[PDB]
Write a protein that binds this ligand. Structure first.
Ligand SMILES: Cc1cc(/C=C/C#N)cc(C)c1Nc1ccnc(Nc2ccc(C#N)cc2)n1
Ligand SMILES: NCC(=O)Nc1ccc2[nH]c(=O)[nH]c2c1
Ligand SMILES: [Mg+2]
Lengths: 412, 556
């Protein structure tokens, strides 16, 4: 109550972003949800004097029979002022990633209890389209803090701090971190105890004045990584050696001390690709020296909060995906691999969308922000399908890789 | 007096930092002035405009035009300057309905709303910006000054504000009468339904009564207008739709502009007439832009044209959408990057047709194109029907599986079945995942001098087979491809090829079946003839055997 004034950054107008086509089921879902929200005073119909637009759609979260409204505020978020005055920043807990269990709660519904600044509401305009545009799209704006908007956690933060006061003083070891509509709650204790404390946390929110029941369990202390590893073999073909030298040449951009000279000379002469080549002892020493180098961390790797995180993903085949998160090229802040399934076994694009969500989650836990994706897929294919698989309440930025990376080989 | 509900005004603003228009009024003939005075007097009586004082600093120019051949004058205010300064509005009529998404209707009635059209009140605070001046006879008195009380014709916000106001009025009637549809186009309302004619007729009267509550009168004289309707380039009929007549001109000589017109008609036609092709005819439009320039039609363009004329020989109609039935989409490959599709529910009755053209690029293949066509049809179908059609595609299930599982990108197409209708999309080649035992190994390289553009390309093999070809007017990238081509050309049915060229790998790993590059095309032709090809990459200049040797030979 008593709204905080918000503005756009200087020299920019509100978002005008086209509503993308929605299926009949998503439209029907949104009509139902919005009718209720309008009844609750959360949103109000607007007029033609509001030119602005932000796209909206609907998703189904993990194990649920009910659609969730999802607004894509990406453009508005860029155009919205950074939040400084009362809160200068949220120094990111480094201990969150170390916890045995981190549960993700959707706290976004709490935002609806805070009125949105009257002069800013127009910038939250969104449209429910009609099939075949047969009837005019239904136009609304928010009267309260919208889910998915940058300003909502910023504005609600003081209310949130007061709400979680007794839980935190009671549970000093438990790490709570907030990103957009999500709350991240870590604990090192037994998973049954963990869930108990999570349900204990829910009540704090539940008992106060009101998809909260849900939880998404992570175990970041078990999150693995991918050092560069070289084959151990008794017999090397010419081909094996070429692949090794190629992999080492690549690695040498990362690790400076790497040498291919001795190995490369095993290839002396023009030989059948499948012919077996004995390693010279000097070749073995070189290989040995290379192995040791690759056991060390990369040199001069550091996170800069002022720079974007970039995430690259390669399709490895058979449901396997590799990825790297970096700021500067060859300095990888995290590398990883997913061998997983979760359905999607016949659908590449579904698998990729799930990978994108997982990597973003890892990014939020580790650095407290989402990365910018380089996606191995054609724009038109991605843009047609990704919303069908999206389970997350935020959305990251992405671009598209049209030229096959040669380095897919070396993350395999 | 029967009280009527007022229409709520939409608040309107000028763009930030901008003031209202001040524009000199043109002098007018004595006859124009007199006619404008008469018009404005009448308009003033109806409350549409009001006289104002000298205090209002604003002005917009007013004109008088006699129609064609006639004695009657009409008032035209030129709002161009005020429109530049007026805020943007939400525009609803973007994205017009496609006829193929409409539902069949037993009856469709037209209602004249022209009374409402000129009667919507304008935001009180914005009215001053609409000021205009009738010049005075002989300029011996001050001009007569007026401003608008209602949405002026030709003003930037009039269509959006009229549409939004009408919509708000109609909303409760539509909601409480789910058995009819209502669509607003210009000063008309169109009401359809499936109701027996008595009930339909009753709904129309009820609608006329509902509109009366805002004081909006509709003529007792019922609309001469009946189906078929000519709308947005279409003919709408109760049970069917088509495009308005498309007649391709006979010509001895074709102008750029003539060809642009032709393609326009053909594109428009293609949403109903199946199989329309624009490729060859569109080619003639490249570069240039001089509108009156004549172009010779190639034999290919003549052939495409003749094929189109045949397709257009008699009228074809689409049916409407039945939500109770599945949507089916079938696609055929037409050649030269051209694809055509039909969308239907029952066999032999299309809702609509259409085409897709290959995207511009250096290299391409049929599977990628088919995939792109599927995505386009999918998106178009979400717009029109709110759902993805089931696809019938000229590609074997096994071909698709081989494709997507090995393709370097993530890719997917939605539920589909194979239809065997040549030409089929197939994979022309697939490279080996492992080196081939028993197959000769070719180490290839090429290099060129950037200045002289002289180069060499060639190979050496484990059998001591060797070739080096001298080359002129070439680049390093071309020599790298040439070398691969030579190895393919000179090997047997199974071959291992070793290259250092990241460029060549990038292209081949994209799996093109066709290219703008002659050399890539020659390589593809060779790949097609092989039984097994393993392509291996190595880094250059590493002392890698057979690679360094061939590098030595081709450099100088
Ligand atoms: C878009 C639209 C244009 C016109 C008319 C525009 C004009 N002029 C008339 C109507 C009623 C509609 N709206 C809808 C909505 C759903 N189904 C239909 N089906 C439908 C419409 C016309 C005919 C006919 N004849 C048959 C079926 N129309
Ligand atoms: N080993 C060569 C090879 O398997 N080539 C190939 C070519 C075309 C194909 N179409 C398929 O479905 N599988 C194919 C395989
Ligand atoms: Mg070389």
């Amino acid at each position: 109550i008593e709204t905080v004034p918000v503005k756009l950054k200087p020299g920019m107008d509100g978002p005008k972003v086209k509503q993308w086509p929605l299926t009949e089921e998503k439209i029907k879902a949104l009509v139902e949800i919005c009718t209720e929200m309008e009844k609750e005073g959360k949103i109000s119909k607007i007029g033609p004097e509001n030119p602005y637009n932000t796209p909206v759609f609907a998703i189904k979260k993990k194990d649920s029979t009910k659609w969730r409204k999802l607004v894509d505020f990406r453009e508005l978020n860029k155009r919205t002022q950074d939040f400084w005055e009362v809160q200068l920043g949220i120094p990111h807990p480094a201990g969150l990633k170390k916890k045995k269990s981190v549960t993700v709660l959707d706290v976004g519904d709490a935002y609806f209890s805070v009125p949105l600044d009257e002069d800013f509401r127009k910038y939250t305009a969104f449209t429910i389209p009609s099939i075949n545009n047969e009837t005019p799209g239904i136009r609304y704006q928010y009267n309260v803090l919208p889910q998915g908007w940058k300003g909502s956690p910023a504005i609600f933060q003081s209310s949130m701090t007061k709400i979680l006061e007794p839980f935190k003083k009671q549970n000093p070891d438990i790490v709570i971190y907030q990103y957009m509509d999500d709350l991240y709650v870590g604990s090192d204790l037994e998973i049954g105890q963990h869930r108990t404390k999570i349900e204990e946390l829910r009540q704090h929110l539940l008992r106060w004045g009101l998809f909260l029941w849900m939880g998404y369990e992570l175990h970041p202390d078990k999150w693995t990584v991918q050092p560069i590893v070289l084959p151990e073999k008794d017999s090397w073909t010419v081909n094996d050696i070429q692949k090794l030298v190629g992999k080492l040449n690549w690695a040498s951009q990362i690790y400076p001390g790497i040498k291919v000279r001795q190995l490369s000379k095993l290839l002396r002469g023009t030989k059948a690709l499948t012919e077996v080549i004995p390693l010279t002892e000097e070749a073995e020493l070189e290989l040995a020296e290379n192995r040791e180098i690759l056991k060390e961390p990369v040199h001069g790797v550091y996170y800069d909060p002022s720079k974007d995180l970039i995430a690259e993903i390669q399709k490895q085949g058979q449901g396997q995906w590799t990825y790297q998160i970096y700021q500067e090229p060859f300095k990888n802040l995290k590398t990883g691999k997913y061998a997983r399934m979760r359905g999607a076994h016949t659908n590449d694009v579904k698998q990729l969308t799930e990978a994108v969500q997982k990597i973003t989650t890892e990014s939020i836990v580790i650095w407290g922000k989402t990365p910018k994706f380089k996606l191995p897929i054609q724009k038109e294919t991605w843009e047609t399908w990704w919303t069908e698989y999206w389970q997350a309440t935020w959305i990251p930025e992405w671009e598209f890789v049209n030229t096959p990376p040669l380095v897919k080989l070396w993350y395999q | 007096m029967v009280p009527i509900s007022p229409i709520e005004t939409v608040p309107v603003k000028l763009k930030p930092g901008m003031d209202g228009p001040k524009v000199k009024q043109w002098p007018l003939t004595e006859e124009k002035i007199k006619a404008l005075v008469e018009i404005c007097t009448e308009m003033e009586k109806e409350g549409k405009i009001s006289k104002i004082g000298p205090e209002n600093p604003y002005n917009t120019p007013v004109f008088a035009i006699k129609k064609k051949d006639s004695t009657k004058w009409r008032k035209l205010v030129d709002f161009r300057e005020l429109n530049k300064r007026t805020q943007d509005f939400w525009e609803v009529q973007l994205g017009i309905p496609h006829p193929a998404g409409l539902k069949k209707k037993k009856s469709v009635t037209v209602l004249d709303v022209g009374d409402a059209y000129f009667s919507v009140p304008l935001d009180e605070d914005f009215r001053k910006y609409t000021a205009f001046t009738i010049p005075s006879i002989n300029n011996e008195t001050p001009g007569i000054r007026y401003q608008y009380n209602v949405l002026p014709q030709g003003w930037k916000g009039s269509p959006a504000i009229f549409q939004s106001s009408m919509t708000k009025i109609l909303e409760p009637f539509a909601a409480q009468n789910p058995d009819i549809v209502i669509y607003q186009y210009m000063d008309d309302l169109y009401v359809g339904s499936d109701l027996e004619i008595g009930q339909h007729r009753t709904k129309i009267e009820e609608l006329r009564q509902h509109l009366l509550r805002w004081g909006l009168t509709t003529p007792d004289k019922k609309h001469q207008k009946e189906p078929p309707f000519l709308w947005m380039g279409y003919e709408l009929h109760p049970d069917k739709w088509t495009v308005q007549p498309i007649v391709l001109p006979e010509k001895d000589s074709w102008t750029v502009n003539d060809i642009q017109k032709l393609v326009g008609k053909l594109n428009w036609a293609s949403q109903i007439y199946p199989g329309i092709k624009v490729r060859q005819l569109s080619k003639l439009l490249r570069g240039t832009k001089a509108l009156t320039e004549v172009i010779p039609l190639t034999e290919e363009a003549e052939l495409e044209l003749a094929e189109n004329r045949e397709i257009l020989k008699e009228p074809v109609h689409g049916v409407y959408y039945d939500p109770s039935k599945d949507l089916i989409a079938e696609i055929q490959k037409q050649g030269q990057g051209q694809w055509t599709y039909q969308i239907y529910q029952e066999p032999f009755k299309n809702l609509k047709t259409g085409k897709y053209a290959r995207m511009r690029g250096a290299h391409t293949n049929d599977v990628k194109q088919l995939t792109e066509a599927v995505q386009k049809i999918t998106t178009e179908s979400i717009v029109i029907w709110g759902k993805t059609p089931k696809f019938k595609l000229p590609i074997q299930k096994e071909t698709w599986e081989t494709w997507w599982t090995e393709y370097w990108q993530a890719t997917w197409i939605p539920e589909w079945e194979f239809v065997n209708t040549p030409p089929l999309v197939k994979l022309w080649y697939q490279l080996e995942k492992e080196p081939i035992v028993g197959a000769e190994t070719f180490y290839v390289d090429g290099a060129a001098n950037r200045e002289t553009k002289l180069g060499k390309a060639g190979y050496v093999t484990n059998k001591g087979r060797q070739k080096v070809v001298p080359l002129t007017n070439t680049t390093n990238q071309k020599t790298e491809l040439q070398a691969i081509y030579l190895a393919l050309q000179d090997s047997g049915l199974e071959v291992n090829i070793v290259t250092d060229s990241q460029y060549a790998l990038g292209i081949i790993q994209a799996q093109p079946d066709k290219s703008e590059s002659e050399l890539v095309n020659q390589i593809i032709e060779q790949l097609i003839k092989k039984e097994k090809v393993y392509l291996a990459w190595v880094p250059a200049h590493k002392g890698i055997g057979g690679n360094e040797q061939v590098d030595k030979l081709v450099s100088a």
